Coordinates of C-alpha atoms and ligand atoms in Angstrom, one line a residue:
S26 CA -20.7 -26.1 -10.4
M27 CA -21.0 -26.7 -6.7
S28 CA -18.9 -24.2 -4.6
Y29 CA -17.8 -27.2 -2.4
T30 CA -18.1 -31.0 -2.2
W31 CA -17.8 -32.6 1.3
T32 CA -16.7 -36.0 2.4
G33 CA -18.2 -36.0 5.9
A34 CA -14.9 -35.6 7.8
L35 CA -15.3 -32.8 10.3
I36 CA -13.5 -29.5 10.3
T37 CA -11.3 -29.8 13.4
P38 CA -9.6 -27.3 15.7
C39 CA -5.8 -27.1 16.0
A40 CA -6.0 -25.9 19.6
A41 CA -8.5 -25.6 22.5
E42 CA -11.3 -23.2 21.7
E43 CA -13.1 -20.8 24.0
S44 CA -16.7 -19.7 23.2
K45 CA -17.5 -18.0 26.6
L46 CA -16.1 -14.6 27.5
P47 CA -13.1 -14.9 29.8
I48 CA -13.3 -12.7 32.9
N49 CA -10.6 -11.1 35.0
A50 CA -10.3 -8.3 37.6
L51 CA -10.5 -5.6 34.8
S52 CA -13.6 -7.1 33.0
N53 CA -16.4 -5.5 34.9
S54 CA -14.9 -2.0 34.5
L55 CA -15.6 -2.3 30.8
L56 CA -18.6 -4.6 30.3
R57 CA -21.1 -6.2 32.7
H58 CA -23.4 -8.3 30.4
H59 CA -20.8 -11.0 29.9
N60 CA -23.2 -13.7 28.5
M61 CA -23.9 -11.5 25.4
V62 CA -20.3 -11.8 24.2
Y63 CA -19.2 -15.1 22.5
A64 CA -16.5 -16.5 20.2
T65 CA -17.1 -18.8 17.2
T66 CA -15.7 -22.3 17.2
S67 CA -15.3 -25.3 14.9
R68 CA -18.5 -26.7 16.5
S69 CA -20.6 -24.5 14.2
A70 CA -18.5 -25.3 11.1
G71 CA -21.2 -27.7 9.9
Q72 CA -23.7 -24.8 9.9
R73 CA -21.3 -22.6 7.9
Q74 CA -20.6 -25.4 5.4
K75 CA -24.4 -25.5 4.6
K76 CA -24.5 -21.8 3.9
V77 CA -21.4 -21.6 1.7
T78 CA -22.3 -24.8 -0.4
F79 CA -24.4 -24.1 -3.5
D80 CA -24.6 -24.3 -7.3
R81 CA -23.3 -21.4 -9.3
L82 CA -24.8 -20.5 -12.7
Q83 CA -23.2 -17.7 -14.8
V84 CA -24.6 -15.9 -17.8
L85 CA -22.1 -13.5 -19.4
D86 CA -23.2 -10.7 -21.8
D87 CA -21.6 -7.9 -23.9
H88 CA -21.5 -5.4 -21.0
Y89 CA -19.4 -7.9 -19.1
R90 CA -16.9 -8.4 -22.0
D91 CA -16.8 -4.7 -22.8
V92 CA -15.8 -3.8 -19.2
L93 CA -13.3 -6.7 -19.2
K94 CA -11.6 -5.5 -22.3
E95 CA -11.3 -2.0 -20.8
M96 CA -9.8 -3.5 -17.6
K97 CA -7.3 -5.5 -19.6
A98 CA -6.2 -2.5 -21.7
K99 CA -5.2 -0.7 -18.4
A100 CA -3.6 -3.9 -17.0
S101 CA -1.5 -4.0 -20.2
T102 CA 0.2 -0.8 -19.0
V103 CA 1.5 -2.3 -15.7
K104 CA 5.0 -3.6 -15.3
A105 CA 5.5 -5.9 -12.3
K106 CA 8.6 -7.6 -11.0
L107 CA 9.4 -10.9 -9.3
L108 CA 10.3 -10.6 -5.6
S109 CA 13.4 -12.5 -4.6
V110 CA 13.2 -15.3 -1.9
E111 CA 14.6 -12.8 0.6
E112 CA 12.1 -10.0 -0.3
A113 CA 9.2 -12.4 0.0
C114 CA 10.6 -13.9 3.2
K115 CA 10.7 -10.4 4.9
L116 CA 7.0 -9.9 4.0
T117 CA 6.1 -13.1 5.9
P118 CA 4.4 -12.4 9.3
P119 CA 6.3 -13.6 12.4
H120 CA 3.3 -15.5 13.8
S121 CA 2.2 -17.0 10.5
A122 CA 1.3 -20.7 10.4
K123 CA 4.4 -23.0 10.2
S124 CA 5.2 -25.4 7.3
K125 CA 4.4 -29.1 7.4
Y126 CA 8.0 -29.6 6.1
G127 CA 9.9 -28.7 9.3
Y128 CA 10.2 -24.9 9.4
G129 CA 8.2 -21.9 10.6
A130 CA 7.6 -18.2 10.0
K131 CA 10.6 -17.1 12.0
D132 CA 12.9 -19.5 10.1
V133 CA 11.6 -17.9 6.8
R134 CA 12.2 -14.4 8.2
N135 CA 15.8 -15.4 9.2
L136 CA 16.6 -16.9 5.8
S137 CA 17.4 -20.3 7.5
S138 CA 18.9 -22.7 5.0
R139 CA 16.2 -25.4 5.6
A140 CA 13.4 -22.8 4.9
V141 CA 15.2 -21.2 1.9
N142 CA 15.9 -24.7 0.4
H143 CA 12.3 -25.8 0.6
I144 CA 11.0 -22.5 -0.9
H145 CA 13.4 -23.0 -3.8
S146 CA 12.1 -26.5 -4.4
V147 CA 8.5 -25.3 -4.1
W148 CA 9.2 -22.6 -6.7
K149 CA 10.9 -25.0 -9.0
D150 CA 7.9 -27.3 -8.8
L151 CA 5.6 -24.4 -9.7
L152 CA 7.7 -23.7 -12.8
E153 CA 7.8 -27.4 -13.9
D154 CA 4.2 -28.5 -13.0
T155 CA 1.1 -26.6 -14.0
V156 CA -1.5 -29.4 -13.3
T157 CA -1.2 -31.0 -9.9
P158 CA -3.7 -29.6 -7.3
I159 CA -2.0 -28.1 -4.3
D160 CA -3.2 -29.1 -0.8
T161 CA -4.9 -26.7 1.5
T162 CA -5.9 -26.7 5.1
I163 CA -9.5 -25.7 6.1
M164 CA -10.0 -24.2 9.6
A165 CA -12.9 -22.5 11.5
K166 CA -12.0 -19.0 12.4
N167 CA -12.3 -18.1 16.1
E168 CA -13.9 -14.6 16.2
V169 CA -15.7 -12.6 18.9
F170 CA -19.2 -11.1 18.6
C171 CA -22.2 -9.9 20.6
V172 CA -25.4 -12.0 20.4
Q173 CA -27.6 -10.6 17.6
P174 CA -31.1 -10.8 19.3
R175 CA -25.3 -16.7 17.0
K176 CA -23.1 -16.5 13.9
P177 CA -21.5 -19.8 12.8
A178 CA -17.7 -19.6 12.4
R179 CA -16.2 -18.4 9.1
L180 CA -14.1 -20.9 7.2
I181 CA -10.5 -20.1 6.2
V182 CA -8.7 -22.0 3.5
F183 CA -4.9 -21.7 3.0
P184 CA -1.9 -23.5 1.6
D185 CA 1.4 -24.4 3.2
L186 CA 3.9 -21.7 4.2
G187 CA 6.4 -22.6 1.4
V188 CA 3.6 -22.0 -1.2
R189 CA 2.7 -18.6 0.5
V190 CA 6.2 -17.3 0.1
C191 CA 6.2 -18.4 -3.5
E192 CA 2.9 -16.6 -4.1
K193 CA 4.6 -13.4 -2.8
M194 CA 7.5 -14.0 -5.2
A195 CA 5.2 -14.4 -8.2
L196 CA 2.5 -11.9 -7.5
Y197 CA 3.1 -9.5 -4.6
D198 CA 4.2 -6.7 -6.9
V199 CA 1.2 -7.4 -9.2
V200 CA -1.5 -7.4 -6.5
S201 CA 0.1 -4.2 -5.0
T202 CA 0.2 -2.2 -8.2
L203 CA -2.4 -3.5 -10.7
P204 CA -5.8 -2.8 -9.1
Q205 CA -5.2 1.0 -8.7
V206 CA -4.1 1.3 -12.4
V207 CA -7.1 -0.8 -13.5
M208 CA -9.8 0.7 -11.2
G209 CA -8.4 4.3 -10.6
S210 CA -10.3 6.2 -7.9
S211 CA -12.6 3.2 -7.3
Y212 CA -9.9 1.2 -5.6
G213 CA -10.6 1.7 -1.9
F214 CA -7.4 0.4 -0.5
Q215 CA -5.3 3.3 -1.7
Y216 CA -6.9 5.9 0.6
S217 CA -6.1 6.6 4.3
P218 CA -9.4 6.9 6.2
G219 CA -9.1 10.7 5.9
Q220 CA -8.6 10.6 2.1
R221 CA -11.5 8.1 1.8
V222 CA -13.9 10.4 3.7
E223 CA -12.8 13.3 1.4
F224 CA -13.2 11.2 -1.7
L225 CA -16.7 10.1 -0.7
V226 CA -17.9 13.7 0.2
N227 CA -16.4 15.1 -3.1
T228 CA -18.0 12.3 -5.1
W229 CA -21.4 13.0 -3.4
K230 CA -21.1 16.7 -4.1
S231 CA -20.0 16.1 -7.7
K232 CA -23.6 14.9 -8.6
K233 CA -26.4 17.3 -9.3
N234 CA -29.0 15.1 -7.6
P235 CA -27.0 12.4 -5.8
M236 CA -28.2 8.9 -5.1
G237 CA -26.1 6.1 -3.6
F238 CA -26.3 2.5 -2.5
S239 CA -24.4 -0.4 -1.0
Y240 CA -24.4 -3.8 -2.7
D241 CA -23.4 -6.8 -0.5
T242 CA -23.2 -10.2 -2.2
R243 CA -24.3 -13.2 -0.2
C244 CA -21.2 -15.3 0.7
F245 CA -19.1 -13.7 -2.1
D246 CA -16.2 -16.2 -1.9
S247 CA -18.6 -19.0 -2.8
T248 CA -20.0 -17.1 -5.7
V249 CA -16.6 -16.8 -7.3
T250 CA -16.5 -19.3 -10.2
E251 CA -13.7 -21.0 -12.2
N252 CA -14.5 -18.5 -15.0
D253 CA -14.0 -15.6 -12.6
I254 CA -10.6 -16.9 -11.4
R255 CA -9.5 -17.6 -14.9
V256 CA -10.6 -14.1 -16.0
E257 CA -8.6 -12.7 -13.1
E258 CA -5.5 -14.6 -14.3
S259 CA -6.0 -13.2 -17.9
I260 CA -5.9 -9.7 -16.3
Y261 CA -2.6 -10.4 -14.4
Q262 CA -1.1 -11.9 -17.6
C263 CA -1.7 -8.6 -19.5
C264 CA 1.0 -7.1 -17.3
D265 CA 4.6 -6.8 -18.5
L266 CA 6.0 -9.8 -16.5
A267 CA 9.2 -11.8 -16.3
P268 CA 8.7 -15.2 -18.1
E269 CA 9.2 -17.0 -14.8
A270 CA 6.4 -15.0 -13.2
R271 CA 4.0 -15.8 -16.0
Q272 CA 4.6 -19.6 -15.5
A273 CA 4.3 -19.4 -11.7
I274 CA 1.0 -17.4 -12.1
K275 CA -0.4 -19.9 -14.5
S276 CA 0.7 -22.7 -12.3
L277 CA -0.7 -21.1 -9.1
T278 CA -4.0 -20.4 -10.9
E279 CA -4.5 -23.9 -12.2
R280 CA -3.3 -25.8 -9.1
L281 CA -4.4 -23.5 -6.3
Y282 CA -6.6 -20.5 -7.0
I283 CA -9.3 -22.3 -9.1
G284 CA -9.7 -25.0 -6.5
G285 CA -8.3 -28.0 -4.8
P286 CA -8.6 -30.7 -2.1
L287 CA -9.4 -29.5 1.5
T288 CA -7.6 -31.1 4.4
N289 CA -8.4 -30.6 8.1
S290 CA -5.9 -29.9 10.9
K291 CA -5.7 -33.7 11.7
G292 CA -4.8 -34.5 8.1
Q293 CA -8.1 -36.0 6.8
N294 CA -9.7 -35.1 3.4
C295 CA -12.7 -32.8 4.1
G296 CA -13.7 -32.4 0.5
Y297 CA -13.1 -30.1 -2.5
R298 CA -13.2 -26.4 -3.3
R299 CA -14.3 -24.8 -6.6
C300 CA -14.5 -21.3 -5.4
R301 CA -12.3 -18.5 -3.9
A302 CA -9.9 -19.6 -1.1
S303 CA -10.0 -17.0 1.7
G304 CA -6.3 -17.4 2.6
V305 CA -4.5 -17.1 -0.7
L306 CA -2.5 -14.0 -1.7
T307 CA -4.8 -13.0 -4.6
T308 CA -8.0 -13.1 -2.5
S309 CA -8.2 -9.4 -1.8
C310 CA -7.1 -8.2 -5.3
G311 CA -9.1 -11.0 -7.0
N312 CA -12.4 -10.1 -5.1
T313 CA -11.9 -6.4 -5.8
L314 CA -11.3 -6.9 -9.6
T315 CA -14.1 -9.4 -9.9
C316 CA -16.5 -7.2 -7.9
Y317 CA -15.5 -4.2 -9.9
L318 CA -16.0 -6.1 -13.2
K319 CA -19.5 -7.5 -12.4
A320 CA -20.8 -4.2 -10.8
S321 CA -19.4 -1.9 -13.6
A322 CA -21.1 -4.1 -16.2
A323 CA -24.3 -4.2 -14.0
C324 CA -24.2 -0.4 -13.9
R325 CA -24.4 -0.4 -17.7
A326 CA -27.3 -2.9 -17.8
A327 CA -29.3 -0.6 -15.4
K328 CA -28.4 2.5 -17.3
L329 CA -27.2 4.3 -14.2
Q330 CA -25.9 7.8 -15.0
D331 CA -22.5 9.2 -14.1
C332 CA -21.6 6.4 -11.8
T333 CA -18.7 6.5 -9.3
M334 CA -17.9 3.2 -7.8
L335 CA -15.9 2.4 -4.7
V336 CA -14.8 -1.1 -4.2
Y337 CA -12.8 -2.9 -1.5
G338 CA -12.9 -6.7 -1.7
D339 CA -16.5 -7.8 -1.9
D340 CA -17.8 -4.5 -0.6
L341 CA -19.3 -2.1 -3.1
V342 CA -20.8 1.3 -3.1
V343 CA -22.1 3.2 -6.2
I344 CA -22.8 6.9 -6.1
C345 CA -24.6 8.2 -9.2
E346 CA -26.9 10.9 -10.6
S347 CA -30.5 10.5 -9.5
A348 CA -33.1 10.1 -12.3
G349 CA -36.0 10.4 -9.7
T350 CA -37.1 8.3 -6.7
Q351 CA -39.2 5.9 -8.7
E352 CA -36.7 5.7 -11.6
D353 CA -33.8 5.0 -9.2
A354 CA -35.7 2.2 -7.3
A355 CA -36.5 0.5 -10.7
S356 CA -32.9 0.7 -11.9
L357 CA -31.5 -1.0 -8.8
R358 CA -33.7 -4.0 -9.5
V359 CA -32.1 -4.2 -12.9
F360 CA -28.7 -3.8 -11.3
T361 CA -29.4 -6.7 -9.0
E362 CA -30.8 -8.8 -11.9
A363 CA -27.6 -8.2 -13.8
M364 CA -25.4 -9.0 -10.7
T365 CA -27.4 -12.2 -10.1
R366 CA -26.9 -13.4 -13.7
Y367 CA -23.1 -12.8 -13.1
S368 CA -23.4 -15.2 -10.0
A369 CA -23.5 -12.5 -7.3
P370 CA -27.0 -12.2 -5.8
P371 CA -27.4 -9.9 -2.9
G372 CA -27.7 -10.9 0.8
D373 CA -30.1 -8.0 1.3
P374 CA -31.6 -6.2 -1.7
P375 CA -29.9 -2.8 -2.4
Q376 CA -31.7 0.4 -1.3
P377 CA -31.1 3.8 -2.9
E378 CA -30.1 6.5 -0.5
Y379 CA -30.3 10.3 -0.8
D380 CA -28.2 11.1 2.2
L381 CA -24.5 10.0 2.2
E382 CA -24.5 9.2 5.9
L383 CA -27.2 6.6 5.5
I384 CA -25.0 4.4 3.3
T385 CA -23.2 1.6 5.2
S386 CA -20.2 -0.2 3.7
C387 CA -17.4 -2.3 5.3
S388 CA -19.7 -1.9 8.3
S389 CA -19.0 1.9 8.3
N390 CA -20.9 5.1 7.6
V391 CA -19.9 8.8 7.3
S392 CA -20.9 11.1 10.1
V393 CA -20.0 14.7 10.9
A394 CA -18.4 16.4 13.9
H395 CA -16.8 19.8 14.5
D396 CA -13.1 20.8 15.1
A397 CA -11.8 23.4 17.5
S398 CA -12.8 26.2 15.2
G399 CA -16.3 24.9 14.9
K400 CA -15.9 24.0 11.2
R401 CA -17.5 20.7 10.1
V402 CA -15.4 17.6 9.8
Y403 CA -16.5 14.4 8.1
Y404 CA -15.2 11.0 9.4
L405 CA -16.0 7.3 9.2
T406 CA -17.6 5.6 12.2
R407 CA -19.4 2.3 12.8
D408 CA -21.7 0.6 15.3
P409 CA -19.3 0.1 18.3
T410 CA -20.9 -3.2 19.4
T411 CA -18.3 -5.6 17.9
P412 CA -15.3 -3.4 18.7
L413 CA -16.5 -3.3 22.3
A414 CA -17.2 -7.1 22.6
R415 CA -13.7 -7.8 21.2
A416 CA -12.2 -5.2 23.6
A417 CA -13.8 -7.0 26.6
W418 CA -12.3 -10.4 25.4
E419 CA -8.9 -8.8 24.9
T420 CA -9.1 -7.2 28.4
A421 CA -8.9 -10.7 29.9
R422 CA -7.1 -12.7 27.2
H423 CA -4.1 -12.0 25.0
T424 CA -5.0 -12.6 21.3
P425 CA -3.2 -13.0 17.9
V426 CA -4.7 -9.7 16.7
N427 CA -5.1 -6.8 19.1
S428 CA -8.3 -5.5 17.6
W429 CA -8.6 -2.7 20.1
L430 CA -5.4 -1.2 18.8
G431 CA -6.4 -1.5 15.1
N432 CA -9.8 0.0 16.0
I433 CA -8.1 3.0 17.7
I434 CA -6.0 3.6 14.7
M435 CA -8.7 3.1 12.1
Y436 CA -11.6 4.8 14.0
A437 CA -9.5 7.3 16.0
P438 CA -11.8 10.3 15.3
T439 CA -14.9 8.5 16.6
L440 CA -16.6 9.3 19.9
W441 CA -16.4 5.7 21.1
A442 CA -12.8 5.0 20.2
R443 CA -11.5 8.1 21.9
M444 CA -13.7 8.0 25.1
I445 CA -13.8 4.2 25.7
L446 CA -11.0 2.3 23.9
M447 CA -8.2 4.9 24.4
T448 CA -9.2 5.4 28.0
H449 CA -9.6 1.7 28.9
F450 CA -6.5 0.3 27.3
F451 CA -4.1 3.1 28.1
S452 CA -5.1 2.6 31.8
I453 CA -4.2 -1.1 31.3
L454 CA -0.9 -0.3 29.6
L455 CA 0.1 2.2 32.3
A456 CA -0.7 -0.3 35.1
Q457 CA 1.6 -2.9 33.4
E458 CA 4.2 -0.3 32.2
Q459 CA 3.8 -1.7 28.6
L460 CA 3.4 1.6 26.7
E461 CA 6.6 0.8 24.7
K462 CA 5.8 -2.8 24.0
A463 CA 5.0 -3.3 20.3
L464 CA 1.8 -5.2 19.6
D465 CA 0.5 -7.0 16.5
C466 CA -2.5 -5.5 14.8
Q467 CA -4.1 -5.3 11.3
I468 CA -4.7 -2.2 9.2
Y469 CA -6.7 -3.0 6.1
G470 CA -5.9 -6.7 6.7
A471 CA -2.1 -5.9 6.7
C472 CA -0.3 -7.0 9.8
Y473 CA 1.9 -4.4 11.7
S474 CA 3.8 -4.3 14.9
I475 CA 3.0 -1.0 16.6
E476 CA 3.9 0.6 20.0
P477 CA 1.0 2.4 21.7
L478 CA 3.3 5.4 22.3
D479 CA 3.4 5.9 18.5
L480 CA -0.4 6.4 18.2
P481 CA -0.4 10.2 18.1
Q482 CA 1.8 10.4 15.0
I483 CA 0.0 7.4 13.3
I484 CA -3.4 9.1 14.0
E485 CA -2.2 12.5 12.6
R486 CA -1.0 11.0 9.3
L487 CA -4.2 8.9 8.9
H488 CA -6.9 11.4 10.0
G489 CA -5.2 14.8 10.4
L490 CA -4.7 16.8 13.6
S491 CA -8.5 17.4 13.7
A492 CA -9.0 13.9 15.1
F493 CA -7.7 15.1 18.5
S494 CA -10.2 18.0 18.7
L495 CA -13.5 16.8 17.3
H496 CA -16.6 17.7 19.3
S497 CA -20.3 18.3 18.7
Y498 CA -20.9 14.8 17.4
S499 CA -24.4 14.2 15.8
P500 CA -27.4 13.2 17.9
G501 CA -27.7 10.0 15.9
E502 CA -24.1 9.0 16.4
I503 CA -24.3 9.8 20.2
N504 CA -27.5 7.9 20.6
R505 CA -26.2 4.8 18.7
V506 CA -23.2 4.8 21.0
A507 CA -25.1 5.3 24.3
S508 CA -27.7 2.7 23.2
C509 CA -24.9 0.2 22.6
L510 CA -23.3 0.8 26.0
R511 CA -26.6 0.1 27.8
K512 CA -27.1 -3.0 25.7
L513 CA -23.7 -4.4 26.7
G514 CA -23.7 -3.0 30.3
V515 CA -20.7 -0.7 29.5
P516 CA -20.5 2.3 31.8
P517 CA -22.0 5.5 30.3
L518 CA -19.8 8.1 28.5
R519 CA -19.8 10.4 31.6
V520 CA -18.0 7.7 33.5
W521 CA -15.4 7.5 30.7
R522 CA -14.9 11.3 30.8
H523 CA -14.0 11.0 34.5
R524 CA -11.7 8.1 33.9
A525 CA -9.9 9.8 31.0
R526 CA -8.8 12.8 33.2
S527 CA -7.0 10.3 35.5
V528 CA -5.4 8.4 32.6
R529 CA -4.4 11.8 31.0
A530 CA -2.9 12.9 34.3
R531 CA -1.0 9.6 34.7
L532 CA 0.4 10.0 31.2
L533 CA 1.5 13.6 31.5
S534 CA 3.3 12.6 34.8
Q535 CA 5.7 10.2 33.0
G536 CA 7.0 12.9 30.6
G537 CA 8.4 12.1 27.1
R538 CA 6.4 10.2 24.5
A539 CA 3.9 9.1 27.2
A540 CA 3.0 12.7 28.0
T541 CA 2.6 13.3 24.3
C542 CA -0.1 10.6 24.3
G543 CA -1.7 12.4 27.3
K544 CA -1.6 15.8 25.5
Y545 CA -3.1 14.7 22.1
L546 CA -5.2 11.5 22.7
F547 CA -6.9 13.0 25.8
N548 CA -7.2 16.7 25.0
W549 CA -11.0 16.1 24.6
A550 CA -11.1 15.3 28.4
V551 CA -9.8 18.7 29.8
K552 CA -11.9 21.9 29.8
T553 CA -8.9 24.2 29.6
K554 CA -7.5 22.9 26.2
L555 CA -3.8 22.7 25.3
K556 CA -2.9 24.0 21.8
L557 CA -2.2 21.0 19.5
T558 CA 0.5 21.6 17.0
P559 CA 2.3 19.1 14.7
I560 CA 3.7 16.4 16.9
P561 CA 7.3 15.9 15.8
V562 CA -0.4 3.1 -0.5
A563 CA 1.8 0.2 0.6
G564 CA -0.3 -2.3 -1.3
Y565 CA -0.8 -5.5 0.7
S566 CA -4.2 -6.4 2.0
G567 CA -4.9 -9.8 3.6
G568 CA -3.2 -12.9 2.2
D569 CA -0.6 -13.2 5.0
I570 CA 1.4 -9.9 4.7
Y571 CA 3.6 -8.1 7.3
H572 CA 5.7 -4.9 7.4
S573 CA 8.4 -3.7 9.9
Ligands
1PV30 C1 -16.4 0.2 -0.6 N1 -16.4 0.8 0.8 C2 -15.4 1.4 1.3 O1 -14.4 1.6 0.6 C3 -15.5 2.0 2.6 C4 -16.5 2.7 3.2 C5 -17.7 3.4 2.7 C6 -18.7 3.8 3.7 C7 -19.8 4.4 3.2 C8 -20.0 4.7 1.9 F1 -21.1 5.4 1.4 C9 -19.0 4.3 0.9 C10 -17.9 3.7 1.4 O2 -16.2 3.0 4.5 C11 -15.0 2.3 4.8 C12 -14.3 2.3 6.0 C13 -13.1 1.6 6.1 N2 -12.5 1.6 7.3 C14 -12.9 0.6 8.4 C15 -12.4 -0.8 8.0 C16 -13.4 -1.8 7.7 C17 -12.9 -3.1 7.4 C18 -11.6 -3.4 7.5 B1 -11.1 -4.8 7.2 O3 -11.3 -5.8 8.1 O4 -10.4 -5.1 6.0 C19 -10.6 -2.4 7.9 F2 -9.3 -2.7 8.0 C20 -11.1 -1.1 8.2 S1 -11.4 2.9 7.7 C21 -9.8 2.3 8.4 O5 -12.1 3.8 8.6 O6 -11.1 3.6 6.5 C22 -12.6 0.9 4.9 C23 -11.3 0.1 5.0 C24 -10.5 -0.1 3.8 C25 -11.2 -1.2 4.5 C26 -13.3 1.0 3.7 C27 -14.5 1.7 3.7
1PV31 C1 -13.8 18.3 29.2 N1 -15.1 17.6 29.0 C2 -16.0 18.3 28.3 O1 -15.8 19.4 27.9 C3 -17.4 17.7 28.0 C4 -18.5 17.7 28.7 C5 -18.8 18.2 30.0 C6 -20.1 18.6 30.3 C7 -20.5 19.0 31.6 C8 -19.5 19.1 32.6 F1 -19.8 19.5 33.9 C9 -18.2 18.7 32.4 C10 -17.8 18.2 31.1 O2 -19.5 17.0 28.0 C11 -19.0 16.6 26.7 C12 -19.6 16.0 25.7 C13 -18.8 15.7 24.5 N2 -19.5 15.0 23.5 C14 -19.6 13.5 23.5 C15 -20.5 13.2 24.6 C16 -21.9 13.1 24.5 C17 -22.7 12.8 25.6 C18 -22.1 12.5 26.8 B1 -23.0 12.1 28.1 O3 -24.3 12.2 28.0 O4 -22.4 11.4 29.1 C19 -20.7 12.6 27.0 F2 -20.1 12.3 28.1 C20 -19.9 12.9 25.9 S1 -20.4 16.0 22.3 C21 -22.0 16.5 23.0 O5 -20.6 15.2 21.1 O6 -19.5 17.1 22.0 C22 -17.5 16.0 24.4 C23 -16.7 15.7 23.2 C24 -16.0 14.4 23.2 C25 -15.2 15.7 23.1 C26 -16.9 16.7 25.5 C27 -17.6 17.0 26.7

């Protein structure tokens, strides 16, 4: 089965697209090498299409069925409810794509009669019709990167707004509750960054001779077959569900999740999908279950001992008991052979690691710093190149997602988020007096509206108070950061230390919540430190979800 079939009609933009870095008066203070930053556009869509279009073969053995039976047994203990129209409506993001049938995200949120009526008719159609393929729109994502001495745009596929509300009605409570029950500690979404760090370190230490590896499948969404999506549905249907929910789930699976026609922004037929849609509600849960299933079965084929898996979407890490260097390397080949038979070959072959910090997953690795007392603190960091390129773009242009804000929240303990992102953007916010203005950002693919003034509390709850006093970062983390700055022509860290004193002083001067940001976020910048005391899960990744 081919992942996609194409008609030849182009994938078209729905608005003007910028590829070149926009520049303003603030741009040079962050980043000088402007021509290294770019954004992807629909002009590279043709290139992506070629990468994501291929034949899938699948060979399923007893290890696969055994694991599947175990997953279903756990799924059978889950009781999920239908959300009402109103509940599903409130989960709809304010700036989500409008319907073709005369209403938008804000009409849905307000329970407008036109929106509510169309949702009711869409739902009724899902109950009464389990065969007719549902239309989808295919777009090129506009995303910002540094040149990798260019990436073609990713493709997003999603159905109409009315359908997206109905998905939430049928399945939101399922995708929010089921994966944790089925996968236990392996379900990565449940942890805050601080809990995840703690889980990883405790898992590494739980093995006598630890070995770990990342496995990243090439173009995972395209590797998802009709069988995979049907198997996912069979898992959902194990739950204790309302009869209405069962029918809607069967309907959505047959008509939408397994595949359907692809329409561009201008309304022309682009082709046909027989793989995972990126923009449906079940994408995150589905990829996580399917990755868990294939990898768990692949662990058994390779005879890996005392495995602990961590899975988040298509990202996978296994930590297990080492059987020896040679024995480990051999068993990974078998793992990859098993995964390939299940349709999920790797982009890069997996490498066994005997140090936790050398494992990268979701672009992140563990590193170590020290708190005020000098005790070791583990935290998750990443290469700051992409965060910094995106920050430079957002310095000059207002975007749908404020990646700088998400990056500060998710990587708050990092050397680069604290010294560069906090310092740069708080200076900008101060200059415009927009500290209290709530901004859209994404945490684990879930959309939130957050005021910068609330960052101290948000950081404390996600990382603990230690995130405001970490020092003595590792030479390797420091060198990676300093090397990235030279590469992009970002000023060196010593300049940011100077700038943070000013920004701290400016924040302290305004009193109130502003001064609290000065005290906690910038305590790293003063030599005479101020004692930091206390300041005063949800289950929806990707697939168009918002919370107040
Ligand atoms: C299976 N892999 C893991 O679960 C993770 C490992 C990992 C690293 C090394 C290792 F050996 C094992 C695991 O690191 C992680 C770091 C993140 N974060 C960054 C982050 C990455 C992507 C997104 B996204 O666009 O969806 C995002 F929102 C945040 S965060 C806030 O710091 O916790 C995450 C979050 C849940 C997605 C997962 C893992
Ligand atoms: C109030 N500020 C200070 O106390 C700090 C001084 C300092 C040194 C001399 C001086 F005269 C005045 C100040 O250097 C620091 C270094 C760091 N680190 C990050 C780091 C590393 C390299 C560079 B550098 O080459 O430019 C850098 F600027 C920062 S580290 C080694 O990992 O602990 C920190 C951590 C973030 C909190 C604080 C200070």
